[PDB]
Design a protein around this ligand. Structure first.
Ligand SMILES: Nc1ncnc2c1ncn2[C@@H]1O[C@H](COP(=O)(O)O)[C@@H](OP(=O)(O)O)[C@H]1O
Length: 222
């Protein structure tokens, strides 16, 4: 894969803000390549050319829950069975895409050597103006207040949810059935609290602490 110096790359672990951020980057730019690869598997061409990369990470509890429901509604994805069973496989990194942990850490470290803007799903929810302003400084692109507010409006969850071009409702019920769980489900940090039992959560915090020791921190609420 021969990369071009101007190509802009969107990199996420699944269920972390791909669709959302693709839309932000889409509008700002008016070549955008997206990938779910872990840093160690990016083609070397992309580093040598010094492509700008936007990475989006999401707190792993919401990511896990989002990934569960998505499994429920996608035909091409394995049966998740239970949130309990799913948790075990998510924490093990025995899910499509592999380990969230390795993903987010590897990209976190990669930003010491490489032109990467590393953003947080939760920071984008809390203050899209602030996050989108970093993107603009990163792309050395300059945009009117009028258009910046337009982007914030256009890429808000409520608006994207009604947008056929982005909500994945232009796919047959038999590949994604939205009656089970919409692809645009809740879009809310802290939603995981409605699904983790207190005991599931204490178990998580004990595995997470071990598996992270990463100056990477997350918000699990806003
Ligand atoms: N415009 C938006 N704002 C906030 N969250 C969004 C969004 N568009 C999609 N999402 C959320 O991002 C997740 C999908 O991520 P990806 O595009 O990488 O698969 C889903 O999470 P939830 O299932 O937790 O709501 C989806 O609702």
């Amino acid at each position: 894969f021969q990369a071009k110096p101007d190509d802009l790359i969107l990199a996420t672990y699944p269920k972390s803000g791909t669709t959302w951020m693709h839309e932000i980057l889409d509008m700002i730019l008016n070549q955008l390549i997206k990938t779910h690869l872990p840093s160690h598997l990016i083609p070397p061409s992309i580093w040598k050319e010094n492509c700008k990369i936007v990475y989006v990470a999401r707190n792993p509890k919401d990511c896990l829950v989002s990934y569960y429901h998505f499994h429920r509604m996608a035909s091409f994805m394995p049966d998740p069975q239970n949130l309990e069973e799913f948790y075990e496989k998510f924490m093990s990194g025995k899910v499509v895409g592999g380990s969230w942990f390795d993903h987010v850490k590897g990209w976190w470290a990669a930003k010491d050597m490489h032109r990467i803007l590393y953003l947080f799903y939760e920071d984008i929810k809390k203050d899209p103006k602030r996050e989108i302003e970093k993107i603009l400084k990163f792309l050395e692109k300059d945009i009117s207040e009028e258009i910046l507010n337009k982007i914030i409006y256009h890429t808000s969850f409520d608006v994207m949810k009604q947008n056929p071009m982005t909500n994945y409702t232009t796919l047959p019920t038999s590949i994604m059935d939205h009656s089970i769980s919409p692809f645009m489900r809740k879009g809310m940090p802290g939603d995981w609290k409605n699904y983790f039992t207190v005991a599931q959560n204490e178990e998580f915090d004990k595995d997470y602490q071990k598996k992270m020791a990463s100056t990477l921190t997350f918000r699990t609420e806003i």
